[PDB]
Design a protein around this ligand. Sequence first.
Ligand SMILES: CCCC[C@H](N)P(=O)(O)O
Ligand SMILES: [Mn+2]
Ligand SMILES: [Mn+2]
Ligand code: NA
Length: 261
Amino acid sequence: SIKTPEDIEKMRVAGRLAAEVLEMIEPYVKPGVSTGELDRICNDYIVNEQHAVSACLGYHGYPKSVCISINEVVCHGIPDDAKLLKDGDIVNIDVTVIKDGFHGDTSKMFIVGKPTIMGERLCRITQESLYLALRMVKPGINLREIGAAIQKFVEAEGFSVVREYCGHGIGRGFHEEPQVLHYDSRETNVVLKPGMTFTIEPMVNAGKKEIRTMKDGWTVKTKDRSLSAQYEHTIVVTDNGCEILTLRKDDTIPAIISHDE
Ligand SMILES: CCCC[C@H](N)P(=O)(O)O
Ligand SMILES: [Mn+2]
Ligand SMILES: [Mn+2]
Ligand code: NA
C-alpha cells in the first residue's frame, strides 16, 4: 500500500525506537552474557522506557521479545538463559517495535570478543549488500532488479544468499505486501512507487545457500553449518529515492538517499 505523510511520520518514530534498542543493547553483547538476558534488557527498555511493545512476542506463538541468532543460525533464534556468548561469535539481534500502531523492524550483527577474519568479512559483505540495495531504491526501480543486484554482489564476493526468507512491506502490519526477495526471481515484478514502506534484510551464508529449520519451528540454520549473517533496515520510498527509518549512529550511510542533482 501507499502510506500517507501521517503514516510515514509514525513509522519514523517506530523505526527510530527500534534502532535505539540496538544502540542501547550494544555494550551488553559481551562474552559470558546469555541471550536470555539480552532479551530481557531489550524488552524492559522497549516497555518501560520507550513505552512501546515488541511485535515479536506472541506472533504466531513466538515466545520472546527479540530474535537473537548466533553463528550458523540464519534467523529467528530464540533467546535462552542457558546460551552464553563466547569469543568469536557473530550475533544478530533482530528488533521489531510497535509504537502508535506502526512497526519498526531492524537488525544488525555484533561480533563477540576477538573477531575471526572470516566472521568480520561475512558481516562486512552482508551489510554492504544491504547498503547497495538501499542506494538503488527509488520510484521506477523493480524489486526484481534490487534482488538481482544483492545476489550478484554477494556471489561475486564468494558468499551465498538465503532464498526462503525475505524482506517485506511493513506498516500497521508486521508483514505486508510486497515480498522483498534478496535474489533474482522470475516471480518478482514490482515497480516501486513513492509512499511504499518495506524492509530489506539479506541473510548471507559463508558456505552454501541451503537452510534447515529446527524442531521449535523458528530456529533456522545453514544446512552445511557455515556462518550466516544478516542486517535489516526499514525504509520508505520517496519521490526520488528512499529514507531509512531505522538508521543508527554506527551506520555509514545517510538516512536520506536522494537521486536528484
Ligand atoms: C518473531 C518473528 C521475527 C520477525 C523478524 N523481525 P523478520 O520478519 O524480519 O524475519
Ligand atoms: Mn526483523
Ligand atoms: Mn523484517
Ligand atoms: Na548467524
